[PDB]
Design a protein around this ligand. Structure first.
Ligand code: PIO
Ligand code: PIO
Lengths: 299, 301
């Protein structure tokens, strides 16, 4: 467990609070913000969920990655002219369903999401889903469009994560602390394994990497790592031109949304946690409801 | 949106607080508790779900936190006091590490006898999502060896004819031109703090739901489970589908892991249950379990 220097997160370690703005005459004026931690763009908008004037709550509507040359003000204005419905319902978990909208022009790169209904896990796109009505029609009045520019870099979600188990190796784990306007949350993630080399030797290799950490708004909150120094011949062959790693933090740690919602978020500490790797023989139990017989749960 | 009567959850709608007990001289005495919703019939070989709770403490000495160690379903005829005593004689190590998410890794040692039906979990290392088995994983040390000192064994009996659900076994909820039967459940937590969640039961092609005479109770599968029993009547097609039986169970910490942060170290109780009848979500709607969507297919495979 060795701490990185604060300079490694100073430049981009801050994510601004999502907030509506007013014009000179007090009317809400939609806005956008671009994070670049420029044609591939991730879009996520925020709006008021209202009756069809009464404001029930705020909700996020992720649109995903699209390739576009349109100016962000044209993406924003077209988005605010759409009629987006909001429903609170359930599948396995409680859901927020956004209705279909159209026609599109500047937003055609995000048509897969916008032109048909979209079902989201309510916990990832809203803190207080219980405020959305079940007996009244609801609609989204968008006030902010968050944009994060991507480089077609390594972008991770739980299903694309690689195997972390290894038998004779040192795991390079990363412990990150977030200060929320103060409340402090922390999480750990596995970066890789240094296959067998002492823990101190591994630390010197990590110092030479000159890692930089920053935050983005992919999924509402993402962690971006950039290698500004040097890496091994084996890791260099695996990665090639890739120097950037990005993690969708609301998909890995959905519990973060309840904490960062409607608040500013910033990296306050980052530490390398070098531990023996978890052996391949150990069993992964993602679900606590385990069935050792064959009779209660299939495969 | 119609509320069920409180009588529908009175009998089994309560889950006791997990807490250690002391003897007449102040020393901790491990205990067990059996929950039998949806499995009240007595049989020699019982299907039993086991989850224990212990103090995570230093080895070479402070109590750092409490953690749950799920053992899963095993078929056994042993008395619960023999399962408990053998479990407390094992030397279980605890490690805080990471995969995709932060993990708590257990390691058991000591041969098994009454615990042989749970050997798959106990005889090799077990990697759990820290959020589902511990509220404050950041209290577990990274620079010291840690051990589990078990104080409670929670047991929930199962009936192999019943339906037991986890996210990967739950069925398709989308349908065109149907009415969804959704269920809104409220839990009162002593903390009182009230949490609520909704789940999809099925789709119809209120009076039919009243005739079902549903009963709701809580169990300790995964630390907290919801059990529904049909005491009235249903259609011939729905009885054939449910496997010719009237029990349905949901592992609530696997569906709604956020509940653990709220119910941890507290008693939990059903305070309200309502049917929420809505138009079904059409099949044309897209499911986005991950908020990081890639419409280009060039960023994510
Ligand atoms: C796109 C996927 C991610 C790309 C790499 C993103 C970075 C990353 O994950 O590094 C892993 C690497 C090796 O560790 P590790 O034991 O995890 O080795 C890899 C791992 O086993 C994968 O699961 C394998 O893929 P697959 O499932 O069998 O296919 C992969 O092989 P292949 O696939 O080649 O056959 C293995 O190489 O870690 C270091 O060198 C430690 C320093 C890390 C410093 C990082 C600082 C930022
Ligand atoms: C292991 C068993 C698990 C399932 C049983 C556990 C309970 C459960 O899941 O019920 C679902 C049932 C109907 O569900 P729903 O109509 O959405 O689902 C369809 C139904 O299952 C048909 O039988 C399937 O085949 P088919 O059309 O014949 O070909 C059809 O498949 P396919 O057309 O897509 O291929 C399914 O889409 O719900 C009610 O009746 C509402 C009252 C619920 C009352 C409360 C119950 C406690």
């Amino acid at each position: 467990v060795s701490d990185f220097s604060p300079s490694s997160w100073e430049h981009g370690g801050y994510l601004d609070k999502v907030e509506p703005e007013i014009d000179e005459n007090g009317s809400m004026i939609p806005k956008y913000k671009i994070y670049t931690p420029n044609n591939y763009m991730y879009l996520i908008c925020y709006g008021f969920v209202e009756d069809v004037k009464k404001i029930r709550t705020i909700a996020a509507y992720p649109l995903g990655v699209g390739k576009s040359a349109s100016h962000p003000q044209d993406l924003l204005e077209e988005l605010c002219s759409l009629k987006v419905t909001v429903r609170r319902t359930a599948g396995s978990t409680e859901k927020i369903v956004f209705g279909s909208s159209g026609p599109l022009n500047h937003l055609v790169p995000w048509k897969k999401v916008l032109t048909s209904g979209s079902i989201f896990n309510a916990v990832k796109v809203c803190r207080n889903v219980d405020q959305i009505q079940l007996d009244k029609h609801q609609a989204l009045r968008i006030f902010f469009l968050s944009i994060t520019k991507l480089n077609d870099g390594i972008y991770m979600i739980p299903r694309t994560m690689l195997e972390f188990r290894r038998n004779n190796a040192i795991a390079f784990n990363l412990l990150v602390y977030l200060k929320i306007d103060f409340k402090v949350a922390s999480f750990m993630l596995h970066l890789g394994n240094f296959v067998r080399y002492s823990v101190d030797y591994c630390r010197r290799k990590i110092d030479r990497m000159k890692l930089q950490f920053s935050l983005g708004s992919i999924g509402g909150l993402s962690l971006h790592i950039k290698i500004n120094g040097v890496i091994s011949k084996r890791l260099f062959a695996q990665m090639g031109f890739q120097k950037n790693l990005c993690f969708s933090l609301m998909d890995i740690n959905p519990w973060l949304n309840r904490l960062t919602w409607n608040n500013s978020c910033e990296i306050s500490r980052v530490a390398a946690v070098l531990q023996p790797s978890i052996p391949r023989e150990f069993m992964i139990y993602d679900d606590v409801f385990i069935d050792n017989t064959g009779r209660i749960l299939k495969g």
